[PDB]
Write an enzyme that holds these catalytic residues in place. Structure first.
Site, PDB file in Angstrom:
ATOM      1  N   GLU A   1      16.911  11.185 -12.006  1.00  0.00           N
ATOM      2  CA  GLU A   1      16.596  12.603 -11.799  1.00  0.00           C
ATOM      3  C   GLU A   1      15.913  13.266 -12.995  1.00  0.00           C
ATOM      4  OE1 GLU A   1      20.638  13.487 -10.241  1.00  0.00           O
ATOM      5  OE2 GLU A   1      19.561  14.469  -8.604  1.00  0.00           O
TER       6      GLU A   1
ATOM      7  N   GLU B   1      21.288   5.933  -4.168  1.00  0.00           N
ATOM      8  CA  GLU B   1      22.486   6.717  -3.859  1.00  0.00           C
ATOM      9  C   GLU B   1      22.498   7.035  -2.367  1.00  0.00           C
ATOM     10  OE1 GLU B   1      22.951  10.177  -6.475  1.00  0.00           O
ATOM     11  OE2 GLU B   1      22.186   8.983  -8.150  1.00  0.00           O
TER      12      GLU B   1
END
Ligand code: NA
Ligand code: NA
Ligand code: NA
Ligand code: NA
Lengths: 409, 204
Positions: B51, B127
Site C-alpha cells: 500500500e 489479501e
C-alpha cells in the site's frame, strides 16, 4: 435435390472484366481512407484499353481514377500485363456498420482511350475495417458485441428455394428483435442475401459448404490430403464470389468436420488472399490453429463440460486458459428447441461483463418444418419421420426462434 | 518475503514512491532484504512492500531484483495490483464474481481480471477474506473459483492473529484490549482484530 437457385444467361464482351477486388484501408482515426481496386481482364490486350474506377456517395461522385493495363513488377518475370490496380483517396469516409449501413457505389468501366465503353461492372462498397487486436474483434476500431443467430435457408412450402420477400421478412424480424449478426449455417447463401445484409446492416459470417459430421472420426476426410482439392474448391470459390461484400466480416471454414490438416492449409490460404477478415472454425475443440476466434457450440456460462479431446469449458474459464488470448464468440448457443431459451439472460450478463466474450449466434432462426396435408386436405406442420423417411431424428429439426411461417415463438 | 515499505497515509498513496529523492531509502529496504534472505528455499516470491501506490521507484526496484535474483518472481499490489512492477496479479479484496470498478485502481472480479485484453499473468490475492469478528462468509466461493480456473492460484487470508493486547483491570484480571483502550487518539476501533485465531492462538 434439384435446381433450387436461379438459372441465368450472361453475355460478356470478348475483351472483358474477368475479376475485380475492392479493398478499403484507413488512417488511425478513420478520417482518411484509400479505396484500392484490382481489376483483371480476359481477351486481347491493346495499348488503347483503359480501366476507370469511380466512387459514388448516392448521386455525388467522390473520386475517379483511370489507368491503362499493366501491373507493378512482382517477381523476376515482371508483372501482370492483364491487370491494373486503381487507388482512390477518400476524405472523411462515411463508415459502414450494422448500426449505420453507409454504402458507396464503385463502378468499374472497361473502355478505350477515346472514351468508348466496352463494359461496366459495379458493387456496393462499405467503408469498414475488421481486425482482431489485443484479443478483441474490432469494427472500425471499436469492440463488437455480436447479437447473432444461425439461419439456414428454409421455406415451409418451397423447401430450400429462397426468395426476396422471405429474406427481407427475416432481416426485418431479426433487426426488430435486436439481432445485428447472422451466421450462414452451413454454406454460402443465395447471392441476394449479402446484398440485403449490406443495405439493411447485418454482420455476416460466410461459411464454406463443408460439413462431414457423419464421419468416424469427424476429421476422417478433412485430415486426408486426397480430399484437400475438393475442400479447397468449396473455400476458394466462396471467397472469390463474396469478398467484395462489406456485410461479410468473418470467413468460416465449414462446420462439424473435426480438425484436419486441410483446415490449416485453407485457413492460411484465406489469410494470404484476404487479410481484411478474420477466419473462424469450430471443429476439433473450437480453439484450434485453424481459428482466429474461440467459437464453441453450446459451451455454458459457468459450467464446464470436460469431454475427452474436445472439452466445452465454461466460456468465462475458456478465455483465461494458460496462454489463451483470442476473443470468444459462440458459433452456436441457446438451443431454441420447443419451450426453450431458459438461462438466456445468463449468457448476456457474461457477454456484458467480460470484454473478450463478444457474444454468439443463437441456434437457430426458423423451425425446419414442412407443410403436409391430411385426409381432408388441411395443412399441418410436419417434421422428420412424417414423410416416411427412416432412420429419422423426429422433432430435432425444429429449433427456431420463429415458426416456419415466421410467427414468433 | 516483503520489503519494509508502507506509505498508506500519503496523498496520493504514491507521493513518496514516485519521488526519486526517496529512491535511496526505498532501495535499501529492498536490497538489504534480498541480501539477507536469498538463500532460504521457503522464500518463493519477493514483494516490494504494501500500500504505497505505484511509483517509478517500484519499477526500478522491481528490475533490480529481477537482475540480481532471477530465481523468484516479484509481486506488488500497489497502484491497482497489475502494474509493470508485478509478475503476479495480486489484488487485495477483489471479489469472485462481483466487479468493483473504482477509478484508476478497480478491483475486478478475479475470474474477469484474468482475461482482460492482453492479460496473461497468474492471479494470487495478496489479501482476501477479511476475518474481522464473525466473518469468512463466502469463503467457499473463492475456493470453488481457485479450483475451476488454472490461473487463479489462490491467495493469502487477512489475517492470522487478532492484534489484541493484555490489559489488567482493578481486580488484576486480564482482558483483550484494542485501539482506544490505551488512551490512543485518533484510533480506528477494533480494525486491528481480523485474525483467524485470538491473540492466545485459540481458534475462531
Ligand atoms: Na463482451
Ligand atoms: Na437441428
Ligand atoms: Na487454480
Ligand atoms: Na486491520
Amino acid at each position: 435435390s434439384g435446381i433450387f437457385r436461379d438459372v441465368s444467361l450472361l453475355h460478356k464482351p470478348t475483351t472483358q472484366i474477368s475479376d475485380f477486388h475492392v479493398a478499403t484501408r484507413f488512417n488511425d482515426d478513420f478520417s482518411r481512407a484509400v479505396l484500392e481496386a484490382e481489376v483483371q481482364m480476359c481477351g486481347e490486350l491493346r495499348d488503347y484499353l483503359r480501366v476507370t474506377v469511380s466512387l459514388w456517395q448516392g448521386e455525388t461522385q467522390v473520386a475517379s481514377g483511370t489507368a491503362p493495363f499493366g501491373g507493378e513488377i512482382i517477381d523476376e518475370r515482371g508483372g501482370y500485363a492483364d491487370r491494373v490496380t486503381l487507388r482512390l483517396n477518400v476524405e472523411n469516409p462515411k463508415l459502414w456498420s450494422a448500426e449505420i449501413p453507409n454504402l458507396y457505389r464503385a463502378v468499374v468501366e472497361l473502355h478505350t482511350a477515346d472514351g468508348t465503353l466496352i463494359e461496366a461492372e459495379a458493387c456496393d462498397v462499405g467503408f469498414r475495417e475488421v481486425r482482431i487486436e489485443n484479443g478483441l474483434l474490432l469494427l472500425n476500431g471499436k469492440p463488437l458485441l455480436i447479437r447473432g443467430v444461425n439461419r439456414h435457408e428454409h421455406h415451409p412450402l418451397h423447401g430450400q428455394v429462397m426468395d426476396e420477400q422471405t429474406m427481407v421478412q427475416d432481416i426485418l424480424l431479426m433487426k426488430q428483435n435486436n439481432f445485428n449478426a447472422v451466421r450462414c449455417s452451413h454454406y454460402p447463401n443465395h447471392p441476394l442475401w449479402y446484398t440485403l445484409c449490406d443495405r439493411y446492416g447485418l454482420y455476416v459470417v460466410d461459411e464454406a459448404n463443408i460439413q462431414t459430421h457423419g464421419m468416424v472420426p469427424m476429421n476422417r476426410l478433412t485430415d486426408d490430403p486426397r480430399w484437400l482439392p475438393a475442400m479447397s474448391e468449396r473455400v476458394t470459390r466462396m471467397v472469390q464470389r463474396d469478398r467484395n461484400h462489406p456485410s461479410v466480416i468473418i470467413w468460416s471454414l465449414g462446420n462439424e468436420s473435426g480438425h484436419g490438416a486441410n483446415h490449416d492449409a485453407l485457413y492460411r490460404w484465406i489469410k494470404s488472399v484476404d487479410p481484411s477478415r478474420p477466419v473462424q472454425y469450430e471443429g476439433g475443440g473450437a480453439d484450434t490453429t485453424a481459428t482466429d476466434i474461440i467459437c464453441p457450440m453450446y459451451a455454458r456460462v459457468d459450467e464446464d463440460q470436460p469431454f475427452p479431446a474436445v472439452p466445452k469449458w465454461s466460456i468465462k474459464k475458456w478465455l483465461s486458459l494458460p496462454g489463451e488470448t483470442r476473443p470468444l464468440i459462440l458459433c452456436e448457443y441457446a438451443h431454441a428447441m420447443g419451450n426453450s431459451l431458459g438461462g438466456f439472460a445468463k449468457y448476456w450478463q457474461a457477454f456484458r461483463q467480460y470484454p473478450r466474450l463478444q457474444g454468439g449466434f443463437v441456434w437457430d432462426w426458423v423451425d425446419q418444418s414442412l407443410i403436409k396435408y391430411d385426409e381432408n386436405g388441411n395443412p399441418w406442420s410436419a417434421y422428420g419421420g412424417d414423410f416416411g423417411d427412416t432412420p429419422n431424428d423426429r422433432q430435432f429439426c425444429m429449433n427456431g426462434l420463429v415458426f416456419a411461417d415466421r410467427t414468433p415463438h
